[PDB]
């Protein structure tokens, strides 16, 4: 029979009951099985973004064909899979392909409309057999179609169907569309909770509900790239597997299995002693760890074979309701149900009390491990040097960052809200704007910021407004239209960020621009949405905005004296409102002003700069004190309000650089020699003792 | 042979313009994100045009579409945002004359995708001086008048001919706030009862609220950062201390200057 | 028997010693593993650039297998890798590559369950003529093939973000 | 008889990417991909020669025949 040599009987699999369940979904499958039972056009097409489960859909119409929750005039049907990948094969000598195809046409036409044809990627069935001055598939089914004896059912990608089939729009009206819904957050989780089953079936583990639910609101807000509910299933699938290889690792065996090869190299080594002593009891903690570790592996290979066995006996009633045999209801459902029900339930709390080394069940600590490690999203649950470590953000701000205080509580607000997770999810995290004279340290904040979360200091996206002083820029950061040349590339910023989803964003200089640079930054600020030049949205909910602008600089180091903090914001306020538009800076979250720097500031930075100096230098080798009258002096010699720090920073670095590495080459700089920065005169001498 | 409307709206920012079309959206779909919102102060020059319409035969990304015609011709009945659409290049309209006059396009690859069941909505925000000047002792008709005058000096005079009703929106008052920082407090309800915490509020803390984010100059968002400072700080401060105990009455209590809270 | 004529037993080599004792990146190997002890997408692509040794990686998996440092799924399995150019080369006229790709896919359900599949060119495979990537499809879903891939991050941008099923 | 000498014969063929991409068979190999398992053999110490365009084209696409 030529049916089986190009087909697939699904029914088949379904009583292998190997599939999906499909859960949901009453609306569509009503809506195909009406578009199957027509008099002409039999054809319905699944449409949708991939994922959503189109596959799945036609697998639940078979699932309820064969459970029989179907209208009569399907009580029977066949439903097949049709297989480019068959048909295609051996197409060598001309009119092959036409010929295994009108076989399957006519075989069909036997079947006395008992039979429904299933075809995956349907466009591939369009483009199939078109080759140069032959015949597809295409102009062979557009007449067994309009007639419609030969029962399609359809599945294609969007943007695909739009490419390929609209292309040759007699097939395209051969079908009707059927548009699958992205399936709902709500819906999502009612899949999740039913298949939960098949998966621990799968990992050998188990699985918590509050995980599931956590799984679909984590996947659902902070990825976007594929869509729901297949992301969520990965996210699930993806924890089932560490906890699997976890189980079947542990880390402390490995600590005491590293020591215990320690000791014995030590030990040969040797050959007082004490360290057979010391190997026979670390090698017999390593032994009960493992034997430990062998014990909680056979309770859970148990409890997960008798689990397997509870889901064959439901597979088996769901045979008994099908097939109607009468002692085996009653016997399986009050026999099996209860007995392994309780017993399951006892392996379980057993495994709560013999798991101690390790972790057995789904939770949401490990969905977001997954999540976090997967993209980069911060997510999971707090541990305690991270939580304590952000609850002294403004501590590890002021170790490389002495004044300013004001945008040190800031910043560190805003990301305790981050970590906290209480931000908008309409708006994005931080969305700042730093006002203060030329160089005050604004820069290697938010550069310190980037070190703080990432342990990273140029992991961001520094985007200077510098350059941007006419219209255009705008179509640099983010993209150029099509037909333009920009097309292909796509935009700078939107890419910057659709690579790394979790970053902080600098737009320095911000003073430099034309004033309508400033939209983008209100589409940023209004959603964390950015469409570029192909036409696609942007998550920026998970990012900081910042802008350092040196607008009322002058008017800072005129009146910060004599003045509190609500009049100088107030009035820098309205220096904005002369220049920039008042519809951008409702968005901003804070406006701190950075008063000039005090000579103690100064000093404290100079003595950041030996610090940073005094590492650099040990990573060169060197052991480096100083005379702080040294320091004394640079503090003096380097004092302008005018221009900020830097005056310092050069000052520094001539006059402590140049006779440095003038005499470190020189082999004169020795490391391991106590080298004192002493005095000169009016420079700076180093001695090697 | 019009779409279903096409509205001008008008006013100062943060008056809820653009919460009126996302309540659109979240009454029509149940969802905020899913219309068409076509972020139209990106378009300060005269090109995406050809990336919201396609590009035509014979260049780069011919064979995708612009962006407007390919999710129209998906889902026919959306409901359109062109927000903010005073900064564009003042003439990118003329594609919408075609879409307000028909709603009709003709796109690249030439299928004329059908709009004439998907709401245009425009947003702008021209109207700051007008409606901050005159507001007051002015009606509602005398208003439209004179800011239809002001929006003819921007724009065409071929183009207001088609706005199906440019409704012009008016500053808030106290109250109004008062009840838009209810709503504020309903969604922090929920965004920190899906993490765990019965929290409640003292109601004089309303009071200070109003006390705080008043300004008739800015709308509604001084008061959205005014809770985001004020309230979030110490309530996520104290959160991450490990010192919040789920279950416990959260109850958002004023201090002398500030809000506490209890655990109780 | 397209096994004997397209696919090499890395066991086999390493087995007679023949391969790299490759050492080191064992927290990729370990992710591998993960990704290949799943129920569904069972199948890693490595991105990087070549000369980094990913082919290398899959061999040090493959000694690993030797030693049996594999979690319960992997013992008794044979790792075999393939080309796509040795596929595409054959293409005279329509439908030869497909036979051996077809053919392929009957020995991968044949041994049933027990072969970890390996392809590099990951991106080569995009392009061949519908040509490679949907015969490829169910296999690909359904669980009953473990390939894994090899390719580099440009032509992972220019390639894979196309088909979703490639994704 | 390559596998009877073992690496005693070391054979010559110039132009690779021509044994490549151009020994057209029906239902029936070439030389290209019926020895590159003798590259994955050792067996085949040979040696080649071509021109630097087609030793680009059809030679260094390839990752065995790298
Ligand atoms: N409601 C659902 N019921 C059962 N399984 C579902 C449901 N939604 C999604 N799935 C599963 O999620 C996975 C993704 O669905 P698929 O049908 O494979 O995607 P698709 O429909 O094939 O679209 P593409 O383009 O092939 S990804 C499959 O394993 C489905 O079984
Ligand atoms: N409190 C501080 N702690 C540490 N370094 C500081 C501090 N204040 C200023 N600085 C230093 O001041 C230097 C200059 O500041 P920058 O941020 O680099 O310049 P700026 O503040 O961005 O102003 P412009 O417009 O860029 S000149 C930096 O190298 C900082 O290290
Ligand atoms: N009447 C309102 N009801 C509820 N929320 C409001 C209201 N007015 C403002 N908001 C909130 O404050 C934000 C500002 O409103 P928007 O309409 O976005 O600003 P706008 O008035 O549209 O000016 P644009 O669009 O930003 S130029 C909204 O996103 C809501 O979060
Ligand atoms: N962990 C490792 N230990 C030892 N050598 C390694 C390791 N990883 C990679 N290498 C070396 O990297 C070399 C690169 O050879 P290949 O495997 O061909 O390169 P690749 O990284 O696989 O990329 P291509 O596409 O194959 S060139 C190998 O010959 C290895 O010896």
Known sequence: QALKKYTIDLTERAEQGKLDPVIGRDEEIRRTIQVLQRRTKNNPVLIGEPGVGKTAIVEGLAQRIINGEVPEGLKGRRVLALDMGALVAGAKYRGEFEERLKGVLNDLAKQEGNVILFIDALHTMVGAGKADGAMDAGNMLKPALARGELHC???????????????????????????????????????????????????????????????????????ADRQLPDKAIDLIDEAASSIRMQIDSPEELDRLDRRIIQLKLEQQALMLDMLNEELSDKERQYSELEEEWKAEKASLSGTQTIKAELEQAKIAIEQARRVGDLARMSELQYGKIPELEKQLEAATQLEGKTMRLLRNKVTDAEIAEVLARWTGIPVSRMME???????????????????????????????????????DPNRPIGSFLFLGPTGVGKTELCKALANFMFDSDEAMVRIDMSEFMEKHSVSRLVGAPPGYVGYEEGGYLTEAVRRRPYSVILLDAVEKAHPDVFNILLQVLDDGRLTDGQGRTVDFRNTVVIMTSNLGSDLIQERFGELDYAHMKELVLGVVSHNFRPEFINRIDEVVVFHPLGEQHIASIAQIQLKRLYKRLEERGYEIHISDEALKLLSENGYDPVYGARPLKRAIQQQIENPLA????????????????????????AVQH
Request: glycine share 4%; hydrophobic share 40%; aromatic share 4%.
């Open 153 to 223: 059912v359809g599945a294609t990608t969007l943007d695909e169907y739009r490419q390929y089939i609209e292309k040759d729009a007699a097939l395209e009206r051969r079908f009707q569309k059927v548009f699958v819904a992205e399936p709902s957050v709500e819906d999502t989780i009612a899949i999740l909770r039913g298949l939960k089953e098949r998966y621990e079936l799968h990992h050998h583990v188990q699985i918590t509900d509050p995980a599931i639910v956590a799984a679909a609101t984590l996947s659902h807000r902070y990825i």
């Open 662 to 685: 003038q005499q470190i080459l020189s082999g004169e700089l020795v490391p391991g020699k106590v080298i004192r920065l002493e005095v000169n005169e009016d420079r700076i001498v």
């Open 385 to 423: 040097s991270e939580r304590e470590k952000l609850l002294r953000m403004e501590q590890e701000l002021h170790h490389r960052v002495i004044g300013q205080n004001e945008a040190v509580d800031a910043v560190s607000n805003a990301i305790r809200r981050s970590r906290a997770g209480l931000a």
